[PDB]
Amino acid sequence: LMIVSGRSGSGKSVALRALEDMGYCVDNLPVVLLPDLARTLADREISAAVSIDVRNMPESPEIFEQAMSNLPDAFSPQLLFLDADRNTLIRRYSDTRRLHPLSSKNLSLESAIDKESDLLEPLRSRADLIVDTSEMSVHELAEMLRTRLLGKRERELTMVFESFGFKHGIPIDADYVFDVRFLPNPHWDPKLRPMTGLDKPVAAFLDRHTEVHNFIYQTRSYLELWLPMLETNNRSYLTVAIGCTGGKHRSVYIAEQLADYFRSRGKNVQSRHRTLEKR
Amino acid sequence: MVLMIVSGRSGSGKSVALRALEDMGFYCVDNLPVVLLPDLARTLADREISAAVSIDVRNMPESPEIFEQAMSNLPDAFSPQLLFLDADRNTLIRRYSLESAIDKESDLLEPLRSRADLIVDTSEMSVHELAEMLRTRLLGKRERELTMVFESFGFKHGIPIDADYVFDVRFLPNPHWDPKLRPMTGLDKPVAAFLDRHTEVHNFIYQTRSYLELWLPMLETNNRSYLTVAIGCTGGKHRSVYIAEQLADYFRSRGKNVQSRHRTLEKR
Amino acid sequence: MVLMIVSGRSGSGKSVALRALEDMGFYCVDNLPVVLLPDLARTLADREISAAVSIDVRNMPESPEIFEQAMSNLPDAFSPQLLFLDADRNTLIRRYSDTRRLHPLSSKNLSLESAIDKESDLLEPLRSRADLIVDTSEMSVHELAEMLRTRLLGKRERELTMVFESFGFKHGIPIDADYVFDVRFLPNPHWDPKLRPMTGLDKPVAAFLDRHTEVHNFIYQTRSYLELWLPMLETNNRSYLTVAIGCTGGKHRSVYIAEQLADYFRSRGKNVQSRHRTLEK
RNA sequence: GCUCAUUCCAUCUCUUAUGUUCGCCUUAGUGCCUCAUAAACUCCGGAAUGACGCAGAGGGUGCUUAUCGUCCACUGACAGUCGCUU
């Protein structure tokens, strides 16, 4: 069961028209009637498409989650939330229509949008997948809806940090590559040179140098930032290639600490120290 | 510390100079009146950061004896330096009465050119000319020098055989959606525009430029002869190209040497 | 004379404003530290010209009271009239990428967005003193300035002087009317023949008009609709603002409603130099 | 610059017939005049711009291609420590 909700003007309509091709485009139903409708569609035995908005929102989400309670299990619900900025929102809604709540309330075109946002927010908090429509025009919005809605693997997006070395060339599975050369070479110490990347003494040497911390952290800020956008798309293995030349001292420790951090954030992480692998 | 100061006829583009020094981290208070410099500089000692200023006919004193007197007043730690500028009279008009205003004003400015630590002829100048001139002028010259190479590759064809840093730009809005765009490539102003609108593009271009900028100095040390950043779309015609270009131009402005390479387009 | 202070959320077109003012003639000052400014005022007193200064995140102290006491030290009682620009996060970011340096709030500040958001509150103290709050959300790199030139070419002394005039269709319409509204469709107690010659301003007529509710709905909606023109009121460039409502003869109905609106905005506190001039003559 | 459809500033003014009912008069007058059905013109205290020419005045036009979006993994290179030898 597909759920298409969001601030008006964010383009629910075009999504529906494309949702009918994906599936059961049906709109403007009191959510209460939904579960029985699902009972009916069980005969249809084909995925569905239900649209809810400020006009179709009963302004009492207790009822909403009540309808969520008696949900036939045949269809698994997913909250798809279109959203965008106020100004654009007004622009598009300037298309011939009439914001229903604004009747009687007479909120300024900007003021009802403000009202509606919070109004529907209950769902939005529980909204499963979000998509901006900040600036995609209706024709641009049509192709963008087609690419993501087809989520075949709605399972996870595994991280995998591959620690490599340059002398044996960039790993072919690399999606990103962050050199690390200019960091303080542990080589300087002859004692540490035989010791491998995982051996605590080198971890100490690296720990001694704060610059290392600065790099890890700033790199954690760089990814996390550009991350969620990626996580939405239908990827199966996002990877980050980290490499000194040696691929035995620096890149080891880096990839290790990063893996730790992101595991902390709960994204499953896979370590791979290409050179240390038995090949 | 430093108290760089500026001069030259109007239209010489002193603002660019100010922009450059700001780029170096030199704080600027352009067009402050002459007299107030000393206590300001005291404040700036409390900033503990080298900075610079400008001067104009507007800031030009009637009696420069006061100028040099207070110029003495400034605390030692902030070393003052004076730059003067010159170009062709009409050359200045392109950036800009129109002969005599300048002539009398030049008499006003003449004491400075006499006092100028450096004088440049900016008649054929350019931002990059000025930026490099400045970098060597103040930061000094290192025979060690980078040459950033920005390559736009297509993940189909493969990651460049040589590449220090690479960035996937698959998530950013795809010009591909509009069919009238499919043929046109990254350097056709249609698509350039089309991206320019979608903010996310600007967001990324920034954050990336910031990441590099932060790790760029260390790399300068150790006399690296090249640093290559390669930016990849799937096909490498639309997104990666645009990003490579703009992202280059920023670093060009900061004056480091740069070289673009649209690997997919250069195939044919 | 006057010393204008220019400011706004980072990269909100501020630079353009300074371009504008220097084009006007206000002495140009960029990014001076807050402290010495009053001394500069003293200096300018010699020049006998207005001045222009910027204050934004760059020259923004952490302590609030700094610019407060600085404003206190202002000499010559020169009117310290502030100016302020603003636009939305997305607009700002799209505008802050002018090959410009970092938001000086790059002290491990997560993202341009995050730093710029906190900027607002950081900069909030300024918002208090605000002789204008013009927005640049709509303008372009070159077009924005055009709008800005328009701006500030005005006298506040010409404060809005709101008006309501009720008139009759029987002879015409006030020629200078800013807005115009027919209301005859509102209930007309012509049924009461005693009210028919009786002046509308009389309480019995007002009570008879009050007897109906459609009038109250109308006025509530109309008064609320007028309040959406507050930005238009800010862009006055006009000595007095007029409002046109006309009955057939004006005296029948329009008066009491104009009275109610006069009450509404006099209640809002607006200047109400109202006149139902066409009524008596 | 010259001179002008322009721009944004200019202080600037009135009407016939429609039927009707109530406020009032002429004493019929078809009215003085409230309500009320439609039809019907103008006009100078600022600051920008385009319109020619002053002044510079030395390739174009139409339509035939572009297949390149997602997603999944074989992977490469002759130019100090020591683990060594004969």
Swiss-Prot record, chain A:
Residues passing through the membrane, by range: none
InterPro entries registered for this protein in UniProt: P-loop_NTPase, RapZ-like, RapZ-like_N, RapZ_C
Swiss-Prot/TrEMBL keywords: Acetylation, ATP-binding, GTP-binding, Nucleotide-binding, RNA-binding
UniProt: GTP binding residues: D53, V54, R55, N56
Keyword ATP-binding: yes
PTM sites of type N6-acetyllysine: K248
Recorded GO CC terms: protein-containing complex
Any single Pfam family the record assigns to this protein: PapZ_C
Signal peptide from the UniProt entry: none
SUPFAM superfamilies the UniProt entry points to: P-loop containing nucleoside triphosphate hydrolases
Null mutant phenotype: Cells lacking this gene strongly overproduce the GlmS protein.
Gene Ontology molecular function: any one: RNA binding
Highest taxon listed in the record's lineage: Bacteria
Family: Belongs to the RapZ-like family. RapZ subfamily.
Subunit structure: Homotrimer. Interacts with the small RNAs GlmY and GlmZ. Interacts with the catalytic domain of RNase E in an RNA-independent manner.
Name of the protein: RNase adapter protein RapZ
Species per Swiss-Prot/TrEMBL record: Escherichia coli (strain K12)
Gene: rapZ
Swiss-Prot record, chain C:
Residues annotated for ATP binding in this entry: G8, R9, S10, G11, S12, G13, K14, S15
GO-annotated biological processes: protein homotetramerization; RNA destabilization
Alphabetized UniProt keyword annotations: Acetylation, ATP-binding, GTP-binding, Nucleotide-binding, RNA-binding
Signal peptide residue numbers: none
Record: residues binding GTP: D56, V57, R58, N59
Superkingdom of the organism of origin: Bacteria
Residue numbers carrying N6-acetyllysine: K251
Effect of K270A: Lack of activity. Does not bind GlmY and GlmZ
Phenotype of the disrupted gene, per the record: Cells lacking this gene strongly overproduce the GlmS protein.
A Pfam entry, by short name: RapZ-like_N
Gene Ontology molecular-function annotations: ATP binding; carbohydrate derivative binding; GTP binding; identical protein binding; molecular adaptor activity; RNA binding
Any coiled-coil regions, as ranges: none
Region feature RNA-binding, mapped onto this chain: 266-281
Record's GO cellular component terms: protein-containing complex
Family: Belongs to the RapZ-like family. RapZ subfamily.
Subunit structure and binding partners: Homotrimer. Interacts with the small RNAs GlmY and GlmZ. Interacts with the catalytic domain of RNase E in an RNA-independent manner.
Function: Modulates the synthesis of GlmS, by affecting the processing and stability of the regulatory small RNA GlmZ. When glucosamine-6-phosphate (GlcN6P) concentrations are high in the cell, RapZ binds GlmZ and targets it to cleavage by RNase E. Consequently, GlmZ is inactivated and unable to activate GlmS synthesis. Under low GlcN6P concentrations, RapZ is sequestered and inactivated by an other regulatory small RNA, GlmY, preventing GlmZ degradation and leading to synthesis of GlmS. Displays ATPase and GTPase activities in vitro. Can also hydrolyze pNPP.
Protein name as it appears in the record: RNase adapter protein RapZ
Species for this entry: Escherichia coli (strain K12)
